[PDB]
């Protein structure tokens, strides 16, 4: 039990790190998606032109 738990402790510290990395990457995807929302709102002017939308 004593040695079994010690390996089990390191087993869970590994799972924490995996969840930590995935969470960090999704934060950057959220910021870029917010910028796409602003461009879609900005792309709705009636003073733009065909070349401006491109």
């Amino acid at each position: 039990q004593v040695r079994g738990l010690e390996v089990g402790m390191r087993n869970a510290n590994d799972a924490i790190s995996i969840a930590q990395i995935a969470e960090g990457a999704m934060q950057e995807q959220t910021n870029m998606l917010q910028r796409m929302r602003d461009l879609t709102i900005q792309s709705e002017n009636g003073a733009n032109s065909t070349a401006d939308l491109v």
Partner: protein, 55 residues
Amino acid sequence: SIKAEMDQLATEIDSIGNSTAFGNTKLLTGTFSAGKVFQVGHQEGEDIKVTVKAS
């Protein structure tokens, strides 16, 4: 002689109508006859319509 004056004044009413522009978009030649749309909110349906008839 009076008509020769009236005639040139009507030419400029044409000239202003075909010139008034926002950078490169003519605003008085009917492209705003059916009001264009600007979005002033952060969700769909929050729009304002500006209509300028040809003059």
